[PDB]
């Protein structure tokens, strides 16, 4: 299972969740930005690691980070 | 001293081959002019001119005159490309001036590049040639 970490530089423009193809990410309430929301990763067991969230992140450097960890059936994306 | 080399006027392998030099251009005596010009060089065992680049002024035309002629022109190309790039970055749209050349600004810079060594010395003294290293975008180490 990979690790998806969300850092405090989040602006809450929800682009990582919309770029997510595996329903890993969701928006939770937060107080550290103007949009008052931070990305969260409650479902990293379904994380394939394809880093579409990191492409969609507009902040510098990144507010979301995917670290490729142990490979399972779900993370290797196998239909077999 | 180059005892392993010989002058091409006294090199016997050059002398048997300079009489068969091919004409490179439309002049029918191009190879004979090349036979006279290459005779003053230093030739090896098979009569080809071996250039000497160590710094001797006897062989200054081998490397030093090509060095002075290159570094003047290459310093000219580098300076007028640098001076154009500084001039266009103060405009409203500095990006379009590189893909669409401001040609009268380019000719004005290029003709002024004949005094690039006195200009590069002056910009080095003024500090505008070299930027401070703490004022530069830097990698996160």
């Amino acid at each position: 299972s990979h690790s998806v970490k969300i850092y405090d530089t989040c602006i809450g423009c929800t682009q990582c969740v919309r770029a997510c193809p595996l329903d890993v990410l969701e928006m939770v309430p937060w107080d550290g930005c103007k949009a008052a929301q931070i990305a969260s990763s409650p479902r990293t067991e379904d994380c394939v690691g394809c880093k579409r969230c990191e492409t969609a992140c507009p902040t510098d450097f990144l507010s979301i980070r995917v670290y490729l960890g142990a490979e399972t059936t779900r993370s290797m994306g196998l239909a077999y | 001293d180059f005892a392993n080399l010989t002058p091409c006027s006294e090199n016997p392998a050059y002398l048997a081959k300079s009489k068969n030099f091919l004409n490179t251009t439309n002049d029918p005596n191009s190879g004979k002019i090349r036979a006279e010009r290459y005779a003053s060089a230093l030739c090896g065992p098979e009569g080809y001119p071996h250039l000497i680049v160590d710094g001797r002024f006897t062989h200054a035309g081998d490397f030093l005159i090509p060095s002075i002629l290159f570094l003047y022109i290459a310093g000219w190309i580098g300076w007028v490309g640098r001076s154009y790039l500084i001039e266009i970055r103060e405009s409203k749209n500095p990006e379009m001036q590189e893909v669409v050349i401001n040609v009268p600004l380019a000719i004005k810079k290029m003709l002024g590049g004949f005094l690039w060594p006195l200009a590069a010395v002056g910009e080095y003294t003024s500090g505008k040639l070299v930027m401070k290293d703490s004022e530069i975008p830097t990698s996160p180490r």
């Binding site: - | 191009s30 090349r34 060089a41 200054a60 035309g61 050349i101 401001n102």
Partner: protein, 39 residues
């Protein structure tokens, strides 16, 4: 006509203008003064 001048002032056209002029210098120097290995 003004936009044709901008097309002639594009980076592809002007580098083809410069390299033709540069090759124009070097060919015409090596045609009247060929075979210069040294000075």
């Amino acid at each position: 006509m003004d936009g044709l001048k901008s097309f002639l002032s594009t980076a592809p056209v002007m580098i083809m203008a410069l390299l033709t002029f540069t090759a124009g210098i070097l060919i015409e120097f090596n045609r009247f003064y060929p075979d210069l290995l040294f000075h």
